[PDB]
């Protein structure tokens, strides 16, 4: 069975992806800046839990994703969920150098990270990625392309996914040519963006290790959904 994703034009792919975007969620309106791992990790896992529900429904709207079997959809999301949360975090953190915008009412800086064991290292990695995106002037249309690449690529170990992946590459190039870039600037920028995906993978694996250590510490209860998504990584 042929997939509709391949018949989309580049502008239709971009429009599909923009229209699939989940919203930017809020944290709690308690005006206390968290420092303890208890309050911090409660706020962050609660936020992630609500974001996961939107991510699953976003994924269903990524062209080509629903052409996969249910089991393959589950595998890709289990593999990619933290990468997808993290690239979203660094995207909406771009305009706040030195800080991470977990939510519009939950902006954290490095000083709050160093009150939680192991947080500062992942914090600094996230900040560097945000800063690099900022200096590349990453566009929203490029961001949604990269996020869909992460979804389809991270667990792809399939002919259909690889063709959809190629189409997303076509779409990134189309956006860069639309933005006026020369041919050399196009492939140089495409490479630069895809190499950051290796760092997003690294941050996800480090974060997954930390989330598991937080799970065993039992410091704050985790949702059943967040626990099953975590559990899939073992």
């Amino acid at each position: 069975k042929n997939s509709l994703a391949l018949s989309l034009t580049a502008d239709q792919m971009v429009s599909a992806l923009l229209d699939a975007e989940p919203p930017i969620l809020y944290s709690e309106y308690d005006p206390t800046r968290p420092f303890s791992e208890a309050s911090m990790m409660g706020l962050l896992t609660n936020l992630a839990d609500r974001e996961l529900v939107h991510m699953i429904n976003w994924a269903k709207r990524v062209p080509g994703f629903v052409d996969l079997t249910l089991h393959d959809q589950v595998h890709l999301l289990e593999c990619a969920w933290l990468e997808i949360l993290m690239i979203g975090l660094v995207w909406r953190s771009m305009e706040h150098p030195g800080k991470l915008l977990f939510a519009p009412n939950l902006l954290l800086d490095r000083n709050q990270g160093k009150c939680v064991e192991g947080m500062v290292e992942i914090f600094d990695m996230l900040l560097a990625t945000s800063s690099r995106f900022r200096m590349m002037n990453l566009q929203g249309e490029e961001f949604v392309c990269l996020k869909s690449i992460i979804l389809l690529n991270s667990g792809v170990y399939k002919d259909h996914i690889h063709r959809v992946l190629d189409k997303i590459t076509d779409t990134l190039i189309h956006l860069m040519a639309k933005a006026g870039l020369t041919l050399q600037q196009q492939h140089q920028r495409l490479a630069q963006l895809l190499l950051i995906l290796s760092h997003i993978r690294h941050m996800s694996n480090k974060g997954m290790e930390h989330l598991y250590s937080m799970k065993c510490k039992n410091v704050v209860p985790l949702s059943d959904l967040l626990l099953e998504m975590l559990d899939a990584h073992r």
Partner: peptide
């Protein structure tokens, strides 16, 4: 049975 299984069916 996973929650993700249920949520992806909605």
């Amino acid at each position: 049975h996973k929650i993700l299984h249920r949520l992806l069916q909605d």
